[PDB]
């Protein structure tokens, strides 16, 4: 509260560790469904079903221009990109567990990282 401060976790790598895991997916070789904004004009159902799109270079754009607050904003928006996956695939099709293998291997390094 009011002049009441918790000890300061040191946030000062969190930006180049962020760029590293972000390096990890995007060279993954089941990252092909989530490596570019899915086509809007050419894939029918996604603009209506998903709110907010989300993929690996637009992460990556935002990292490289300080659109990211803190290290979960960053998080929120990786999960996003598995989350739409998993709303618009079915679990037994490629992308659908391309999907799954992707937030599994996000979230071991996230762990291993920063917890």
């Known amino acids: 509260s009011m002049s009441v401060k918790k000890p300061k ?3 000062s ?3 180049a560790l962020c760029s590293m895991i972000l390096t990890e ?3 993954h070789e089941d990252a092909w469904p989530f490596l570019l904004p899915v086509n809007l004009k050419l894939v029918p159902g996604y603009k209506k079903v998903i709110k907010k799109p989300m993929d690996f270079s637009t992460i990556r754009e935002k990292l490289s221009s300080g659109q990211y607050p803190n290290l979960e ?4 928006d990786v999960r996003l990109v598995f989350d739409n996956c998993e709303t ?3 679990d037994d099709s490629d992308i659908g567990r391309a999907g799954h293998n992707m937030r599994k291997y996000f979230e071991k390094k996230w762990t291993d990282t920063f917890k």
């Not at 904003?73 to 929120?76: E, G, K, Q, S």
């Open 9 to 11: 976790r040191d946030d």
């Open 13 to 15: 790598k969190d930006l």
């Open 25 to 27: 997916m995007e060279t």
């Open 73 to 76: 904003t960053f998080a929120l």
């Open 88 to 90: 618009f695939n079915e």
